[PDB]
Amino acid sequence: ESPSLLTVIIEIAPKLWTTFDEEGNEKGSIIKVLEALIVFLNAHLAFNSANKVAVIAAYSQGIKYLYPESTSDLKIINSDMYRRFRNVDETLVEEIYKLFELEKKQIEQNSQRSTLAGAMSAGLTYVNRISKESVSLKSRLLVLTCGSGSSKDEIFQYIPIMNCIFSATKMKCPIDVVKIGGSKESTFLQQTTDATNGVYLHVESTEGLIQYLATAMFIDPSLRPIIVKPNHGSVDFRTSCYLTGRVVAVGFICSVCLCVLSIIPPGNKCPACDSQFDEHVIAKLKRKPVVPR
């Protein structure tokens, strides 16, 4: 019906992708996804002539907007392609070459924290600009993340990612998640899809990725309410504890700071906001169930 903007977030980092190839047998699988991504983006442009395409890449040292290219050319695809498709594909690949060249130069730099959260936050701002600028345009988020590489700690990724969920729900912007790696489920990324009418997909093999994207990640915002999502995973809407790192069903949260606590913290004091609890009040929680004598 109406044009829709597709904002694909690509979490390509040298550390993440390298570990994926050694465990598997698909050397240079990033090319397979990249070339498949080119077709998928072209398919989005082929759905309608009034829809735009945006690509944001999350590299080790930060984020970069692959398309549209900043105002500040090699031949990788034949120049006989359609102009609009070529104008996006050639620029995208051209930015890819620059991105890898910059990353290779700064390979020695030590990176420990993933920048996936930052890329999503930047994408949300870009979606607002495009929607705000033009006026009656839809939007959609698609994250193609390689989860094979073990993450350091997702705890600090909770606050940014969860914040983006509410913003996406405010402006009716479904978020689609695609995972390529060993882990079947991503607790925080899964919540993004479920909480915003999005789709979460996980594929172990990179080969034949276009089929998944075309059939599962091609649900445009226009026909969301009339299309059943292919998501199969089930979430629990739970959170991990603050000093034990395990899912808690029933627990205690500090009123001042709302810090989840599976058990009473040592010293009868909050372990995060350093708030002293009343001994009488906490003793109520410690009280055991009443049983007849």
Partner: protein, 356 residues
């Protein structure tokens, strides 16, 4: 100069936003919304009439209040015929309050208002509230006179003893009791008595009350609240709900007694244990770690990039630099993103993008 005039006005507007510190705020709230429906509310200063607009804004306030405070509860009271009328019990269901207000929209207002009656009812309604919650009372006063059966001063003293907080929104002018009620009840603070200056200004006042109020240092109460996280379950056949006792397709299962509920967040009807989702608490996180305001970059220095870091919008060349930088990460941003990042989002993309 016309373009500069807008710029300087933005700087003056940004002047207030500069002073932001992480004040302690009570996320858990218990609000008693009081609306004045008296003869004085039949005036035409607000089109079509004061009663119609106030009810309309009340519905919007209810939608906004529960949207940003999912773990809060609200109650509605109305003053009519010199008496306080209760129209909705304190509950966590936003639909119940909206439905009650819609019905009220039909009845014409008449009679005189009675603040003492309204406050007394609010005091009783807030008696069965946990000590960890913040007791707040939003009063919409339009009349310049109050008819009460007893001594208002005694009630005000009782309100202070009960640690209740009162916010009053006037329509015409200042009332001596309202100033005293808003002052003695807020530790002498005089910023809780607000009078609208036009139709538009009223919208901001209602929106402002949504944000949780900061807590006083001396009024410090720390405790641990027991809560639960039920797991959503899908059933092939409808089953009776433990809350309304009606046939529903499915519901969340309480982890303490396995009793099912229809909608969240609500207290379990069986074990009286507050049931919530991880998302519900996540929303109130921005009030605990507010994003530091961005400071405009002077034009004297040299800018980093010609396009926005987060939206890739070319900065117009045009006197005043159209760039705002974040001190934490030192990343320039356009004017549009800063408003979007501080009103819709609550995380600076530049800070997140920086690795460590």
């Amino acid at each position: 100069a016309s373009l500069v005039a807008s710029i300087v006005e933005a700087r003056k507007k940004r002047t207030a936003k500069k002073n932001i510190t992480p004040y302690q705020r009570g996320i858990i709230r218990s609000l008693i919304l009081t609306l004045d429906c008296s003869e004085a509310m039949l005036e035409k200063d607000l089109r079509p009439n004061r009663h119609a607009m106030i009810i309309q804004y009340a519905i919007d306030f209810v939608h906004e209040f529960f949207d940003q405070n999912p773990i809060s509860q609200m109650g509605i009271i109305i003053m009519r015929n010199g008496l306080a009328q209760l129209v909705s019990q304190v509950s966590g269901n936003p639909q119940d309050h909206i439905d009650a207000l819609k019905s009220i929209r039909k009845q014409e207002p008449k009679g005189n208002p009675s603040l003492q009656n309204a406050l007394e009812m609010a005091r009783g309604l807030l008696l069965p509230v946990p000590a960890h919650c913040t007791r707040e009372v939003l009063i919409v006063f339009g009349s310049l006179s109050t008819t009460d059966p007893g001594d208002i001063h005694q009630t005000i003293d009782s309100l202070v003893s009960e640690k209740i907080r009162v916010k009053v929104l006037g329509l015409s002018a200042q009332v001596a009791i309202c100033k005293e009620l808003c002052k003695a009840t807020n530790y002498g603070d005089e910023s809780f008595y607000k009078i609208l200056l036009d139709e538009t200004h009223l919208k901001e006042l209602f929106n402002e009350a949504v944000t949780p109020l900061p807590v006083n240092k001396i009024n410090k109460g720390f405790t641990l609240v027991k809560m639960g996280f039920p797991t959503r379950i899908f059933e092939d056949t409808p089953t009776f709900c433990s809350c309304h006792s009606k046939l529903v397709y499915g519901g969340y299962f309480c982890p303490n007694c396995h009793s099912k509920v229809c909608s969240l967040p609500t207290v379990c009807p069986c074990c009286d244990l507050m049931l919530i989702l991880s998302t519900h608490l996540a929303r109130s996180y921005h009030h605990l770690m507010p994003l530091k305001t961005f400071a405009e970059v002077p034009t004297t220095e040299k800018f980093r990039s010609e396009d926005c870091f987060s939206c890739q919008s070319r900065f117009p060349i045009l006197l005043t630099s159209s760039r705002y930088r974040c001190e934490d990460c030192k990343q320039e941003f356009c004017v549009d993103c800063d408003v979007f990042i501080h009103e819709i989002l609550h995380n600076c993309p530049g800070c997140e993008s920086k690795p460590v």
